[PDB]
Amino acid sequence: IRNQRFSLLKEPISSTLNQHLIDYPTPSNLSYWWGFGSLAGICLVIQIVTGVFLAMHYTPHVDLAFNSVEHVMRDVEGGWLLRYMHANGASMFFIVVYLHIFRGLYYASYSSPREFVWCLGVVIFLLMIVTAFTGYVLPWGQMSFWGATVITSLASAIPVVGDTIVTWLWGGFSVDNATLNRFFSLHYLLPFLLVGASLLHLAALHQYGSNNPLGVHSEMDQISFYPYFYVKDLVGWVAFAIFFSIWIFYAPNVLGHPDNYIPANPMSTPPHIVPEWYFLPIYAILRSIPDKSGGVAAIALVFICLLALPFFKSMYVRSSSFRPIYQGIFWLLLADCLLLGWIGCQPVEAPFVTIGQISSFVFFLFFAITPILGRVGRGIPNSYTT
Amino acid sequence: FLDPKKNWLAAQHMKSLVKRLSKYGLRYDDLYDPYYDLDVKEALNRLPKEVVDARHARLKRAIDLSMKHEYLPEDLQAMQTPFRGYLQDMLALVKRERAEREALGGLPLYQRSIP
Amino acid sequence: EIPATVAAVKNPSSKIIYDEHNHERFPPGDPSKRAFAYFVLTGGRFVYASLIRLLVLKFVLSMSASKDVLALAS
Amino acid sequence: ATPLDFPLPGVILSPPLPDYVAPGKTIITTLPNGVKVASETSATPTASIGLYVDCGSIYESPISFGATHLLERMAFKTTRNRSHFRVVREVEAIGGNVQASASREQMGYTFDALKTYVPEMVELLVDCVRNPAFLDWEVNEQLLKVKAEIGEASKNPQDLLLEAIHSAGFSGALANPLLASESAINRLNGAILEEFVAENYTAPRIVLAASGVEHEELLSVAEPLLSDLPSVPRPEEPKSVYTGGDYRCQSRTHFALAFELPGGWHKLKDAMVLTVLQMLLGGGGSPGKGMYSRLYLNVLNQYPQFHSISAFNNIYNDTGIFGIQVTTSSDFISKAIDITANEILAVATHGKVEQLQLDRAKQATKSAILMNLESRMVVSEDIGRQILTYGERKPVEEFLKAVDEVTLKDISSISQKLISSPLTMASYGDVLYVPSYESVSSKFPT
Amino acid sequence: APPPPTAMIYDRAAEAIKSKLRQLENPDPRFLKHGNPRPALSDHTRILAAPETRVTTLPNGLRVATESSLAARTATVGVWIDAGSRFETEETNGTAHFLEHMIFKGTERRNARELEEEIENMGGHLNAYTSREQTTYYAKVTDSDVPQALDILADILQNSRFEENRISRERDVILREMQTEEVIFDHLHATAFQYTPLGRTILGPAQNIKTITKAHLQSYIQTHYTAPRMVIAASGAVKHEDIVEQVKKLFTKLSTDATTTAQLVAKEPAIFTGSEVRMLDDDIPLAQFAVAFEGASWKDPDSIALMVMQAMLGSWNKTAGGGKHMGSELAQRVGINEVAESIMAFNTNYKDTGLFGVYAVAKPDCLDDLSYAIMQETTKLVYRVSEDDVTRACNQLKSSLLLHIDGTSPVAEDIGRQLLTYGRRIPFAELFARIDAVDASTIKRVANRFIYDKDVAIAAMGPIQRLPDYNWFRRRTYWNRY
Amino acid sequence: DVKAAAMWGVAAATGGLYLVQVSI
Ligand code: HEM
Ligand code: HEM
């Protein structure tokens, strides 16, 4: 077969690309919820390109960051489109990542074979959180500066080295020009680390294969990826493009905060310091239990639970379509996450703090009830046997 | 002309090449890489197993000498035949077969894979 | 008791039944309507080419000169 | 674009042949070195030209077994003047079909195309036969192909039974297996093949045969190419002594019987009576293909356990083999052997063969010969084989007279001569249920 | 001191191989004078002379065609009928096969035993077979038995009597008779010409086989074996006047129905619908698949171009002597890489449609590469084609068409088939002119008409798991290079 | 092919004039 040349895809120059993007077998029954990984990759590429073209007109200086952003908006031809694309596409990137994560949670796309895939996804989530935080600090608005101050003040929670760590991260005794330059360099660096992590993510999944909505062993009925899943992914991309244009050209600043258009005044403070909408569940988990070290420990516990989710055993039935109790638990979890995100954009009054305390408890009750349910349902076949 | 009987420069070049090949314990045809043209690969596949194994032994000895940063002993260097050809005729036969096949509009028997 | 696959293999029947639950086949005899599908795809390609061209030009002209330096030239 | 149902307007039509075209008499010309050149004229617009050599599997030294099989495999390949690619491309360019056949007493190289390509056909055939370059890589590739063929050689039981019968019965020249073996394939090489060809493809043993070629043109083409061969005396034909034997290969059940004739194709009358007897016995594997023969009427029609029974023969120069090849159920093997022996004895005994049956067999043999002669390839093969066997092409009417001269007494005498020879039996399959060769031979006379 | 070239083993081997290579570098012109590998057009008019085929039309529409060679010793006489398995109904599908099995086993004058005895006694033998659009009963005899064979043929066609006890036994033997190449082709026909008469298999389903009775066979004969669709082809040592006289004397009381095969084809015609049938088992050692486009009719002027295109896509076999040096590019691609056990291009012609494709047998591992090679070569014929390749294909087609006609039986088969399909016997000179009137431009035009962006029908059986699916072949049907 | 190369050059020129759009 190798004596003389054949289809150029099989040639060594395009062998890996063919094997991983064209001839790769995937289950034929994948729904539209499986295009979100490719859609998130497209969002990441859009962010990288748009940021690369924004850094040509952005000056990371406390006296020039906001003015440079406004220069991009007004003087630069298409700069308003560039910055709106960047911000709203970070928002859509987090949206599609959330949909990715929750679809994985529903279909148990992590359990036995894709534990490394889930762990790489959690690492990717951490990288995205850090990158988005630094990028939001970059414009040097009022909200950006004070959110940076508060979130870095969380780092003063380790009982021994918290103060040293926060002082070293700040570049000084307060958020200032050194912090702005540091965050600009980190915000440029991390997306390439994000690309590497995404490549490892895709390779780790391609080691075993994509899960299917049934959750069953899918190797008898599989189809080539290109002719059939490139068109479905194209439909997803065009729908996302319609959504993205809707949120850029007509509602650009709806997802953003109005206080970010006020130049950063360290002396004054906004009445309500709130992070971006996609950090709201984490902020609410932080502020649920009253403490600072306690809140940091709660965030660490959230990430540890996410990392330890795939390593639970006796989850023989994978898909939630055949688990009524687990489906109800997942829907309660999604409602809890939405409620937690809504709470994160609210003051620390009595009903809000009580609901935030309850919501975090439900969030961890999800991560306990899932192993409990798996262990209980391991003996289902012997009991219902007929 | 490139001939070590009418050209002093050609004679000197042949002497230097013979000296280098004898020092490394090699033969000129052993310098031909199968991965280069694939005509050498076809010629070596057609060549007898004894000759191919001898070429491999000579090449391994030369590689070992290069790794050790040494040459062959004086007696072995003296008893060397750097230009005792064994592959040129088969290579010419393969090349002329390929030329005949291409002239008549025939698909090549072997094709280089794109790296 | 004959296997269904074996019976289907050993009995090639002219009358072939498809699924037809979400794709109603054309009656046997009508020509294939491939021109219409190709032209629908051609309209979609019109759209995609327009988007690609405008995105590329937007990026290039953003990297190009700005109104501030254009006005300072006088 | 004229439809096929309408004649094309611009085509000039060749004149039609007359209804009765004179049958061209065979013309034989012997070159001074001993090469015989033969040709025949045909009304068919295509011609078949073959090169037949008296060399065969019998002329095989212990160091060159399988050489004939390799030569059949290495039939038309690279030569000292044109490469294998050039040979194949020439054959395709003129559109011709080329093939070769190897037997126990002769080898042939058949090449047939349109009649206007006679010089090119003769030249390519003579080149590829007389001047072969047995390149080592090509020989190795053909050896690998033969290895695969041997690995998948158990599908056909009939050829295996014939080979086993020949090997068991004969202990001399014919004892050499026509099909190559694993050891022979492992040891053969291009040098051995070339030495074998040089020793055995000599001028006196080489003959041209033609079916649709005028003698003058073919002779003019072939004289410059075949007259250069040296004149060397032909070696004496190796002799084989027939001894009754047994072969058993435990792997249904397939077996066969055989006997020997003192005279082969040189005793034309006896050989043709043997052919008539073979047609009379007939066969069938369960109209007009032989469902009213003796074996079909007395064996297949009264024993469903008989899967497939037929009568086989093989007539070589100065020798003959005749027997019954049959496959049946494993548990029915003893009764099957008894029935076959009883049928052979009944044919041997006088008065059991009916005059009507003999007449039907005689007419069937005549019709089979006449219809076989229809094909141009068979005509060329007949010319070449007859020249190799005798030195001249005996006319078809002599074979017709030999067929018509067969009588009940003659067929009974031939069957007695058959049953008077020692028995050769070969069984392949569920062997351990068969009776013993001593019992089988006791079922027959000496 | 360097040792002599004969001192060591590998030096001796190198010297021997060099000497062997040195004895073939010098050819001689006397062994290369006439041979030429480059194909070239030739004029065969001086040899394309054959006995005239005399065709006579009886008043009832019966046709009698003879090719007389009085010098021959044997002759063949046959009856070709333009009614096959396509011109039947859904309720009676196996009727043609059942009739061709039952037509040699009973007559009101001779029973099966007497008929077989009469056939055997004169030496000649008679055969019969039914295609999807033709049905032939022929007999090869000695030149003196031609009237007897003709009388037997007329007797079996007309005076046949179907005994019920014989019908039951033939039904049992057919159910017992219930290569895989014919299976693949039957599935391909069913999935290509679906819901049309050509979709049905020749043998027919067992449910319709079981219900066949004497009345059904008699009705089928009376409604389809009508004289206008009936041609007696004689070849060899026969006289046209004698054959016509015997046919007039014997072939009487034949059915006379106004319905013609042309109107039967016009009603409910055959339409090619692109489809595939996959029968993955993985229990068979080899995978056999056939991908076929839509061909041309018998009288279509592009049919000869389709035969030429088949010739330039010639068959290749693992045991073929050509090896990897075959003329066609597809055979070269398959043989060089050894990606298939045996490939063969087929072109089947029917009254109003046809098939043109490649049937391949290959190991399970090489299915994708073999399919790529097949589609690549076919679309190459679509887009760019070589003049020398077309010339070689034309020469091969002419040679094959003239080598197949070798004998009285092939001559009679050609006569009958050509009268049933073209309505006439195409002379050799005109056929050669038609073949050689096909060039690179004609090949490109015909391939554009029949192949370019046209739906395929794929029938595959075996370990077909690496075989590309329908969309892959459909996309490979055309090139995006230009 | 010369014609194929010419048509592809025409297509490339049309694409370039669609992208850059010199004097539309
Ligand atoms: C290396 C590529 C990137 C560069 C050079 C870059 C650069 C910038 C710059 C200069 C800004 C401020 C300008 C403005 O917002 O108008 C910004 C804002 C931002 N970036 Fe990035 N960025 C990159 C990638 C990303 C990625 C991958 C994300 C998502 C994880 C992201 C998230 C954000 C967010 C949320 C903002 C705030 C937008 C706002 O509301 O003003 N950036 N980026
Ligand atoms: C940068 C953001 C991300 C990108 C670009 C990305 C990309 C992809 C891609 C391309 C796939 C394969 C296609 C698919 O199955 O949907 C995939 C699958 C998957 N991803 Fe991600 N991903 C991202 C974030 C995450 C995160 C945060 C998680 C959570 C741990 C995650 C978990 C998974 C899982 C479990 C699968 C397997 C899907 C299945 O088999 O059902 N991904 N991802």
XYZ file of N, CA and C in Angstrom, chain D residues 69-149:
243
model
N 7.324 -25.891 -13.350
C 6.331 -25.007 -12.751
C 6.829 -23.568 -12.712
N 8.100 -23.369 -12.350
C 8.648 -22.016 -12.348
C 8.696 -21.433 -13.755
N 9.048 -22.251 -14.749
C 9.083 -21.777 -16.128
C 7.697 -21.368 -16.600
N 6.672 -22.122 -16.204
C 5.304 -21.699 -16.480
C 4.996 -20.379 -15.785
N 5.467 -20.217 -14.546
C 5.294 -18.945 -13.851
C 6.164 -17.857 -14.470
N 7.432 -18.164 -14.729
C 8.349 -17.243 -15.404
C 8.213 -17.348 -16.919
N 6.983 -17.213 -17.413
C 6.705 -17.505 -18.815
C 7.168 -16.381 -19.732
N 6.576 -15.199 -19.588
C 6.844 -14.063 -20.465
C 7.242 -12.886 -19.585
N 8.544 -12.742 -19.360
C 9.074 -11.707 -18.488
C 10.330 -11.143 -19.137
N 11.128 -10.433 -18.343
C 12.285 -9.725 -18.872
C 13.234 -10.674 -19.595
N 13.765 -10.205 -20.716
C 14.678 -10.963 -21.557
C 16.009 -10.218 -21.657
N 16.896 -10.724 -22.512
C 18.167 -10.058 -22.757
C 18.049 -8.907 -23.744
N 16.878 -8.707 -24.342
C 16.656 -7.642 -25.312
C 15.563 -6.672 -24.897
N 14.509 -7.152 -24.243
C 13.428 -6.304 -23.765
C 13.103 -6.663 -22.324
N 12.721 -5.657 -21.543
C 12.380 -5.870 -20.148
C 10.969 -6.439 -20.022
N 10.619 -6.833 -18.795
C 9.286 -7.369 -18.536
C 8.216 -6.323 -18.812
N 8.475 -5.075 -18.414
C 7.543 -3.994 -18.701
C 7.360 -3.815 -20.201
N 8.454 -3.866 -20.962
C 8.351 -3.723 -22.410
C 7.575 -4.878 -23.029
N 7.799 -6.101 -22.543
C 7.071 -7.257 -23.066
C 5.575 -7.089 -22.832
N 5.197 -6.768 -21.592
C 3.782 -6.615 -21.269
C 3.174 -5.473 -22.069
N 3.903 -4.365 -22.202
C 3.353 -3.212 -22.900
C 3.196 -3.490 -24.389
N 4.118 -4.249 -24.987
C 3.949 -4.658 -26.378
C 2.718 -5.538 -26.540
N 2.548 -6.503 -25.630
C 1.406 -7.410 -25.716
C 0.099 -6.633 -25.619
N 0.017 -5.689 -24.678
C -1.190 -4.871 -24.566
C -1.361 -3.954 -25.772
N -0.261 -3.405 -26.295
C -0.349 -2.467 -27.408
C -0.927 -3.133 -28.645
N -0.490 -4.359 -28.950
C -1.111 -5.081 -30.060
C -2.405 -5.764 -29.652
N -2.770 -5.707 -28.373
C -4.017 -6.268 -27.900
C -4.020 -7.767 -27.715
N -2.889 -8.433 -27.921
C -2.875 -9.877 -27.902
C -3.014 -10.456 -26.509
N -3.315 -11.749 -26.478
C -3.368 -12.531 -25.253
C -2.213 -13.519 -25.259
N -1.505 -13.601 -24.138
C -0.316 -14.433 -24.020
C -0.454 -15.307 -22.780
N -0.035 -16.564 -22.898
C -0.134 -17.509 -21.794
C 0.858 -18.637 -22.032
N 1.046 -19.462 -21.006
C 1.928 -20.613 -21.106
C 1.339 -21.779 -20.330
N 1.693 -22.987 -20.759
C 1.231 -24.212 -20.126
C 2.404 -25.163 -19.959
N 2.456 -25.831 -18.811
C 3.498 -26.800 -18.505
C 2.853 -28.139 -18.189
N 3.371 -29.203 -18.800
C 2.825 -30.538 -18.588
C 3.928 -31.513 -18.205
N 3.595 -32.800 -18.133
C 4.573 -33.811 -17.761
C 5.475 -34.226 -18.913
N 5.157 -33.838 -20.147
C 5.972 -34.234 -21.286
C 6.234 -33.117 -22.284
N 5.658 -31.932 -22.102
C 5.844 -30.850 -23.060
C 5.414 -29.540 -22.423
N 5.980 -28.446 -22.927
C 5.648 -27.102 -22.483
C 5.314 -26.247 -23.694
N 4.285 -25.421 -23.563
C 3.843 -24.581 -24.658
C 3.714 -23.135 -24.234
N 3.949 -22.245 -25.197
C 3.852 -20.800 -24.991
C 2.918 -20.245 -26.060
N 1.659 -20.022 -25.693
C 0.633 -19.619 -26.644
C 0.489 -18.103 -26.662
N 0.329 -17.551 -27.863
C 0.206 -16.107 -28.050
C -0.727 -15.892 -29.232
N -1.884 -15.280 -28.991
C -2.877 -15.090 -30.040
C -3.343 -13.642 -30.082
N -3.416 -13.095 -31.290
C -3.878 -11.730 -31.517
C -4.501 -11.672 -32.907
N -4.661 -10.463 -33.437
C -5.190 -10.307 -34.782
C -4.175 -10.794 -35.813
N -4.672 -11.066 -37.019
C -3.852 -11.713 -38.036
C -2.783 -10.795 -38.613
N -2.946 -9.477 -38.502
C -1.964 -8.559 -39.066
C -0.744 -8.370 -38.176
N -0.757 -8.908 -36.958
C 0.355 -8.787 -36.027
C 1.214 -10.045 -35.981
N 1.222 -10.831 -37.058
C 1.976 -12.086 -37.058
C 3.473 -11.877 -36.856
N 4.153 -10.980 -37.587
C 5.605 -10.844 -37.368
C 5.961 -10.444 -35.949
N 5.238 -9.477 -35.380
C 5.504 -9.056 -34.008
C 5.223 -10.180 -33.020
N 4.128 -10.915 -33.226
C 3.803 -12.045 -32.359
C 4.911 -13.090 -32.376
N 5.341 -13.494 -33.575
C 6.382 -14.512 -33.693
C 7.676 -14.023 -33.064
N 8.040 -12.767 -33.324
C 9.293 -12.232 -32.810
C 9.290 -12.180 -31.288
N 8.202 -11.679 -30.695
C 8.120 -11.610 -29.239
C 8.113 -13.001 -28.618
N 7.375 -13.939 -29.215
C 7.328 -15.298 -28.687
C 8.705 -15.948 -28.722
N 9.379 -15.866 -29.872
C 10.692 -16.484 -30.015
C 11.687 -15.843 -29.061
N 11.648 -14.515 -28.931
C 12.549 -13.847 -28.000
C 12.308 -14.316 -26.571
N 11.054 -14.253 -26.115
C 10.743 -14.582 -24.730
C 10.980 -16.049 -24.406
N 10.988 -16.929 -25.402
C 11.253 -18.341 -25.132
C 12.739 -18.663 -25.237
N 13.380 -18.271 -26.340
C 14.761 -18.657 -26.597
C 15.760 -17.868 -25.761
N 15.481 -16.599 -25.459
C 16.438 -15.723 -24.788
C 15.814 -15.136 -23.527
N 15.623 -15.947 -22.487
C 15.094 -15.415 -21.228
C 16.196 -15.029 -20.256
N 15.983 -13.910 -19.574
C 16.887 -13.432 -18.530
C 16.186 -13.649 -17.194
N 16.582 -14.702 -16.485
C 15.942 -15.071 -15.223
C 16.551 -14.229 -14.112
N 15.994 -13.037 -13.922
C 16.496 -12.130 -12.902
C 16.115 -12.627 -11.513
N 17.029 -12.428 -10.559
C 16.879 -13.031 -9.239
C 15.652 -12.499 -8.509
N 15.406 -11.189 -8.585
C 14.256 -10.619 -7.888
C 12.941 -11.119 -8.477
N 12.855 -11.213 -9.805
C 11.647 -11.746 -10.426
C 11.439 -13.210 -10.059
N 12.520 -13.993 -10.038
C 12.409 -15.395 -9.648
C 11.940 -15.509 -8.204
N 12.449 -14.643 -7.323
C 12.018 -14.664 -5.928
C 10.546 -14.290 -5.793
N 10.093 -13.297 -6.561
C 8.683 -12.921 -6.522
C 7.794 -14.071 -6.985
N 8.182 -14.739 -8.074
C 7.413 -15.892 -8.531
C 7.465 -17.037 -7.528
N 8.595 -17.208 -6.839
C 8.683 -18.222 -5.794
C 7.718 -17.919 -4.657
N 7.608 -16.647 -4.270
C 6.641 -16.265 -3.243
C 5.212 -16.530 -3.707
N 4.919 -16.217 -4.971
C 3.587 -16.491 -5.505
C 3.280 -17.985 -5.480
N 4.255 -18.816 -5.856
C 4.055 -20.262 -5.816
C 3.914 -20.752 -4.379
N 4.631 -20.137 -3.436
C 4.449 -20.471 -2.027
C 3.012 -20.222 -1.594
N 2.463 -19.065 -1.972
C 1.070 -18.772 -1.645
C 0.125 -19.767 -2.313
N 0.394 -20.108 -3.575
C -0.455 -21.060 -4.286
C -0.451 -22.424 -3.606
